[PDB]
C-alpha cells in the first residue's frame, strides 16, 4: 500500500497463506529463482524455535511505470508447521493481496479449512473481511497419487466459489507464475 518517493517506487505486499507444509516456501523459492539478480532483494528468513517468517521483494518485469514510479512486489509467508498464531496475524499487516496455498492431500483437507478460518480470523483483527482483499486459491500438490478432486478442496476453503482457483505443482513450478499473475491482476486493478 506504500509509496516511496526516494527510490521512485510503489510497494505491494503479497502474502502466501495456508496450512503448514502446503507449499508456500516452494512457491516463493520458485518465483525467487526466475527473477534476475538486479531486480530482487535478498530472501530473508527470521525464525525463533516456535515461529518463522520468510520474505523477499522484487521489481516485476511485467509492469508499467505509473508516472515515473516503478512497482515493487514484497512476498511474505509463514513457512513450516505453526505452533503460534502471532506470526500469521502479523504477516497480514498492510497486505494487498493474498495467495492461499491449499494442500491436495486427503489428510490435510481439515487443515485447509482450518487455515482459511484462521486467515479470516486474523483479517478480522485488522477490520477486513474476505471480500476486502484480493485472494486467490492455489490447489497445490496436484501430483500426489491421492490428490483430492480440486472441487472438493475448493469447497472447504471457498464454498461459494468467490475466489479464483488455480491448480499447481509448486515443486515443478507448475501453476506458480500463473497463480502470482492472478493475484497481481486483482491487486493492480484495484490500484488503477
Spell out the residues 6+ positions from residue 151 whose beta carbon is closer than 8 angstroms to its own: none
Question: Applying CB under 5 A, does 20 fall inside the site for Mg ion?
Answer: yes
Site for Mg ion in 91-110 (CB under 5 A): 108-109
- Work out what residue 171 binds among ligand GDP, Mg ion, none; the CB cut-off runs from 5 to 8 Å by kind: ligand GDP
Question: Applying CB under 5 A, does 56 fall inside the site for Mg ion?
Answer: yes
Question: Applying CB under 5 A, does 158 fall inside the site for Mg ion?
Answer: no
Single out the residue of 9, 10, 29, 41 in contact with Mg ion (rule: CB under 5 A).
41
**CB-wise, 70 or 174, nearer to ligand GDP?**
174
**CB-wise, 10 or 171, nearer to ligand GDP?**
171
94: cell is 498492510
Neighbours of 85 (CB within 10 A): 14
Q: What is the nearest approach in angstroms of Mg ion to the Cβ of residue 23?
A: 10
Single out the residue of 124, 143, 149, 191 in contact with Mg ion (rule: CB under 5 A).
124
Distance of alpha carbon 75 from alpha carbon 95, whole angstroms: 10
Buried/exposed 136-165: b ≥16 CB within 10 Å, e otherwise: bbbbbbbeeeebbebeebbbbbbeeeebbb
* 46 assigned to a ligand binding site: no
* 80 assigned to a ligand binding site: yes
* Beta carbons of 56 and 28 less than 8 angstroms apart: yes
Question: Applying CB under 6 A, does 41 fall inside the site for ligand GDP?
Answer: no
Q: What is the nearest approach in angstroms of Mg ion to the Cβ of residue 78?
A: 5
Site for ligand GDP in 72-131 (CB under 6 A): 79-80
Opening angle at CA 9, ends 26 and 63, nearest 5: 60
Neighbours of 6 (CB within 10 A): 5
- Work out what residue 41 binds among ligand GDP, Mg ion, none; the CB cut-off runs from 5 to 8 Å by kind: Mg ion
Distance of alpha carbon 22 from alpha carbon 110, whole angstroms: 12
Distances (CA, A) of 87 to 11, 26, 66, 84: 21, 19, 33, 7
* 180 assigned to a ligand binding site: no
Binding residues for GDP, as ranges, are 21-26, 80, 140-141, 143, 170-171
Amino acid at each position: 500500500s506504500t509509496i516511496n518517493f526516494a527510490n521512485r517506487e510503489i510497494n505491494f505486499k503479497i502474502v502466501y497463506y495456508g496450512p503448514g507444509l502446503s507449499g508456500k516456501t516452494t512457491n516463493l523459492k520458485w518465483i525467487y529463482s526466475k527473477v534476475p539478480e538486479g531486480r530482487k532483494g535478498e530472501m530473508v528468513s527470521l525464525a525463533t524455535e516456535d515461529e518463522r517468517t520468510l520474505f523477499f521483494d522484487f521489481l516485476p518485469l511485467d509492469i508499467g511505470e505509473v508516472k515515473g514510479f516503478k512497482t515493487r512486489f514484497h512476498l511474505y509467508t509463514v513457512p513450516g508447521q505453526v505452533f503460534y498464531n502471532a506470526s500469521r496475524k502479523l504477516i497480514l499487516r498492510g497486505v494487498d493481496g493474498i495467495v492461499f496455498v491449499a494442500d491436495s492431500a486427503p489428510n490435510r483437507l481439515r487443515a485447509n479449512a482450518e487455515s482459511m478460518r484462521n486467515m479470516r480470523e486474523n483479517l478480522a483483527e485488522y477490520g477486513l473481511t474476505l471480500d476486502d482483499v484480493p485472494i486467490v486459491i492455489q490447489v497445490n500438490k496436484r501430483d500426489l497419487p491421492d490428490a483430492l478432486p480440486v472441487e472438493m478442496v475448493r469447497a472447504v476453503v471457498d464454498p461459494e466459489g468467490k475466489f479464483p482457483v488455480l491448480e499447481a505443482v509448486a515443486t515443478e513450478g507448475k501453476g506458480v507464475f500463473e497463480t502470482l499473475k492472478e493475484v497481481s491482476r486483482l491487486v493492480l486493478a484495484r490500484v488503477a
